[PDB]
Structure formats: C-alpha cells, structure tokens
Amino acid sequence: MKALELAKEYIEKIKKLENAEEAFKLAVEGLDKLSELVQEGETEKEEALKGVKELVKIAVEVLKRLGAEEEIFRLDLHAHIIYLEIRT
Amino acid sequence: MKALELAKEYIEKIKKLENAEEAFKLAVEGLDKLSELVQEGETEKEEALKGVKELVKIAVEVLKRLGAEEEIFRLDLHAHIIYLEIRT
Amino acid sequence: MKALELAKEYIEKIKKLENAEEAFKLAVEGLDKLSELVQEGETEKEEALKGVKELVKIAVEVLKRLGAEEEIFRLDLHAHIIYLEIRT
Amino acid sequence: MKALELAKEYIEKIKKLENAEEAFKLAVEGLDKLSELVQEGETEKEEALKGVKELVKIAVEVLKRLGAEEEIFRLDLHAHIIYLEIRT
Numbered sequence A, B, C, D: 001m002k003a004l005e006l007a008k009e010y011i012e013k014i015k016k017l018e019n020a021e022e023a024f025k026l027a028v029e030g031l032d033k034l035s036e037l038v039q040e041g042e043t044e045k046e047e048a049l050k051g052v053k054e055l056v057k058i059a060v061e062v063l064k065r066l067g068a069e070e071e072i073f074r075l076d077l078h079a080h081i082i083y084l085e086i087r088t
C-alpha cells in the first residue's frame, strides 16, 4: 500500500514542524510523490486519492496552527491540480 | 438538490462579510465542498456547476466591494480548477 | 465567428491601456468569456483556442511594456487552465 | 526528437543563470514550448513528458541555488498544469 505509507511518512514528518515554509514545502513534495506513485503504475487511483486527502488534512491543520493562510490556499490549489493529475 | 442548497448556505454566509480574507476563505471552502458533493455521487454534474457559478458570482461581488483584487483572481483560478475537477 | 470577434473586441480594448492591473483584469475576463462561449455550444473548440492564443499574445505584449511580470505569469497560468477547460 | 532537443536547449540556457526571475521566465517558457510541441503533432506525449521532467529538475535546482522558493512552487504548479495539458 505505497500510497498510504507515503502519506504516513509525510504526515509523520510534517506534524513535527513549527516552520510554515518547511511544512508547505513538504506537503507539496508529498503530493508530488503521491502523483508520481500512480504514474509509474504502482498503486491504484483510489489509494493515491485517499493519501492526498489525509496528507492535505494534516498539512492544512499544521499551517493553520502557524497562521500561514497564503500557503494554505496554495496547497489546496496544488492538491486540486494533483487530484486532476491522478484521474488521468 | 444538495448543490443548490450548499451554494445557498454559502452565499448567505458570505453576503454578511466585511472582511476579504474571510470571504475568500469561505468561497474557496464552498467550492471545495461543491466538488466534494459530486465525487461522492450525491448530485449530478450540471447541478454542481450551477452552484459554483452562483457562489462565485456572489463572492466576487463582495470581494469587489472590499477591493480585494488579488483574492478575486485567486478565486477565479480555483473556480476554474474546481470546474475542471467536476467534469471528471 | 463569435470566438474571433470576442478576441477582437478584447484585443482592441486592451491595446489602449497604460495600467497593468486593468489590462490583466481584462485579459482574464476575455479568457473567461472565451471559455464560456464554448460551454454554451456557440463555437467550436478550435475557434476558441485560436482566440485565446491571440488575446494572450496581445495581453502579454502590453504587460511586458508595463513591466508586469507577476501578472504575465498569472495570465499564462490562467490561459493554460482555460485551455484545459475548453478541450472538455 | 524535438522534445529532448528543446529540453536540452533550455537546460543549457538556464544553467548559465545567476538571476532567478530570468531562470523562472525561461523555465516556464520552455514548458510552454514543450506543450506547444505536442499540440502541433510533432512529438509523442511520452517524449514531451520526459523533457518537462528534465527541464523542471534543472530549473528547480538553479532556483534553489538562488533561494527562489516562491518561484519554485510557481514552476511546479505550472509544470503540473503543463503535464495535464499534454495528456489531452
């Protein structure tokens, strides 16, 4: 279950953070790697979508702790583009 | 008619606002939830598209009252990505 | 030929400008209306794509006159999203 | 192999840079031209995707040298939109 383990790893990493550029960088990276996972054919679409949603939830929570509103909208936009990218 | 009722609720909320980050946050949230509505299979595409257009119209009107041009373009971009997201 | 006439009208409007927020606003509006043209079924995809390209060329030229680099990238991104929006 | 030669030309250009707005401008331009390559029917999708990935890797490396984080996220977003644009 590569998608859920990647989401797991990235959620773990991100929860530790008290910097917002750092957490944003990591969230977008995790989303990139979630999309890369599907493109190579190594997990089904539904699994990647689940991972994206869980990672994004955690990342947006952290960002809201640090008050990083701009970054929150930026990650949501990227999440929506990533979401489109996965469904072919 | 879940889409129109969600658009209705969000239009109602947003019209009350005199803050631009608040109205922007709410518009994008409503658009997220409009897209989420379809993904679960709980309303047809045409209905969600209508809701997105009506919500976006109201939100952009409010934002123009408060002079929030940056946010206006940001919501339009998100509206277009959401629109793509709905049509599979 | 609704697409080319809309592009024509908007190119005409935009060439007159010496403000960059104004020209950007108008370019994005023209692109919105170009996409709206297709959605209603009132011109073929190829025609709208042509109009988008010509309008975007003119708008980016004007913006470069005024040195509005941020807006240029923003219009290009919106142009690419609009382009995706048209091809279903 | 038009895609790889375009990526090659642009990678060559970009490696020379010590300005971040310049390298960003060039990366996005190369990605535009990579997408334009496919639309005219002059290279297969897989080739353009390879070129986009290699160009983006180099550009993001340069940008990280110059500390241009905002531009990095902007190029990644554009890379994802370009990627969607290529797969029809």
Ligand SMILES: [Zn+2]
Residues within 6 Å of the ligand: A028, A031, A032, A078, D076, D077, D080
């Ligand atoms: Zn990305």
Ligand SMILES: [Zn+2]
Residues within 6 Å of the ligand: A076, A077, A080, B028, B031, B032, B078
């Ligand atoms: Zn969203």
Ligand SMILES: [Zn+2]
Residues within 6 Å of the ligand: B076, B077, B080, C028, C031, C032, C078
């Ligand atoms: Zn638009």
Ligand SMILES: [Zn+2]
Residues within 6 Å of the ligand: C076, C077, C080, D028, D031, D032, D078
């Ligand atoms: Zn572009």
